[PDB]
Design a protein around this ligand. Sequence first.
Ligand SMILES: O=c1ccn([C@@H]2O[C@H](COP(=O)(O)OP(=O)(O)O[C@H]3O[C@H](CO)[C@@H](O)[C@H](O)[C@H]3O)[C@@H](O)[C@H]2O)c(=O)[nH]1
Ligand SMILES: [Ca+2]
Length: 539
Amino acid sequence: MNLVNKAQLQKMAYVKFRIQEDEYVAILNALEEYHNMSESSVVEKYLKLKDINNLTDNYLNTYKKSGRNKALKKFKEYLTMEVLELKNNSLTPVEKNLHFIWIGGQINDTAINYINQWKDVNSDYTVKVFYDSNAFLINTLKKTIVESATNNTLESFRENLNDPEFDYNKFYRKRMEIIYDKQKHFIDYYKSQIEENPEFIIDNIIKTYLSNEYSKDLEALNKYIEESLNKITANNGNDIRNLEKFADEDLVRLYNQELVERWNLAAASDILRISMLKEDGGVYLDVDMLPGIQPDLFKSINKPDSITNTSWEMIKLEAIMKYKEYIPGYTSKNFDMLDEEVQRSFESALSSKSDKSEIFLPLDDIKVSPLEVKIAFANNSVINQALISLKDSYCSDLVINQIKNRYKILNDNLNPSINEGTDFNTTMKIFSDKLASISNEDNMMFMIKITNYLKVGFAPDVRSTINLSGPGVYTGAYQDLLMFKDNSTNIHLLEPELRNFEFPKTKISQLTEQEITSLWSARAKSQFEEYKKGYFEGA
Ligand SMILES: O=c1ccn([C@@H]2O[C@H](COP(=O)(O)OP(=O)(O)O[C@H]3O[C@H](CO)[C@@H](O)[C@H](O)[C@H]3O)[C@@H](O)[C@H]2O)c(=O)[nH]1
Ligand SMILES: [Ca+2]
């Protein structure tokens, strides 16, 4: 998998009596100087490969009928193989920072109890729980707007509870039409304030607004902020509102968009995570991930043949939490189904184990190439609940670029749509019709998936988020990397190519109680029934 020589490339692409064309010369020259760059940085070696790839399709575009074309197409696959070789031979241990993010409200003790498992076993890592000291009321504002929209939708459904078919479908449709209004009433208010005084703090705009419109208690809100601040402070809280240079001015604008306007804490955390990884380097994790388990802790408890690999992984953590009680409250539902005998095999293993570092596996030295961002996989697909990146790695810039290029398209089309439109449905139509008119084979899927942006968090099955700041931007980045592009939106990467970027398996346990709980954010008819219930179950 060593890249072909200029010499050998001449053999591949040889056509008897054919003139050495200027564009073919360029290729050969470039490839020769690549083999002359051993002392160069890996990024500089990658950029030399990239250049060569651009020279090759410029030949293939200039001479569409050339006899060289078949080998030149092969050659381009070797360039891509070559990226992998660079990446595998440039491994170096990540900055030992461990990142979590909790924004928009008070951290739960659940979050704290998981994080602690990581902190307790990674003493050589700096744990940093990123929070936004200006934005503790985001979940409150949201819960309030959503609460108000709900109770207004039910008032309108009041006598029609039993028939014909005012079901969950129509509830969310109509509630959404109301949420949009209330959300746009706040955004317009927040915007006006920010044009008035730009030193104005988010939470201060939100309390002023809750107090007037939703009759929310100023005192209580200030109290709430004080508790949030104090709690994260005590728990390695790192305020993003101190940190200077990390700030891409466009990413900052996207973060705020997702935080203050869209109230989507997941999206802003998507944006925040990669930005901090680019600025700080390290391992990023969602607060619902726990450390991996020592390989040997359980290595002689043979899995009963009937139970799945997934359950078993889930069982092992529950065994850990039954017998060590590290996280109080942690479930044993699955564990307690096993034969008493196996349960005791688990108990035994956990008896001769003194400290937590003999139970979980410490990150220690994780290596990564400047060319990559490692990512977790769930169910054969990438998932960005766990990431690894050197500071200022080439792949974190590909990711950030992807986020910027996607949002530009979203914003360029959605802002004009919001402006013109009496209501939600009117705006959505304007927006879809806008998205349709610039859509093509390449970006069609993307357009489809971000069409429902305005419903994210407010209705089920929306996927906009995935395609702007989540898993899609990473496969977009990985394809950019391997295919020497800067615009991948139509992804032809397969699982085993993408496995080249997998977060090391033994060093994370994804199958925690909280995670599995968060995989049920399928459909809830049960909510429109519980909101129904909140109207005969009361005063
Ligand atoms: O009030 C909140 C809620 C979420 N988060 C952040 O979002 C992360 C993911 O939250 P989670 O409850 O796990 O939501 P999911 O929908 O299960 O998250 C999935 O989808 C998101 C895509 O936006 C990604 O951020 C996650 O990595 C991915 O696991 C958390 O760790 C937090 O950093 C907050 O900061 N505040
Ligand atoms: Ca989750």
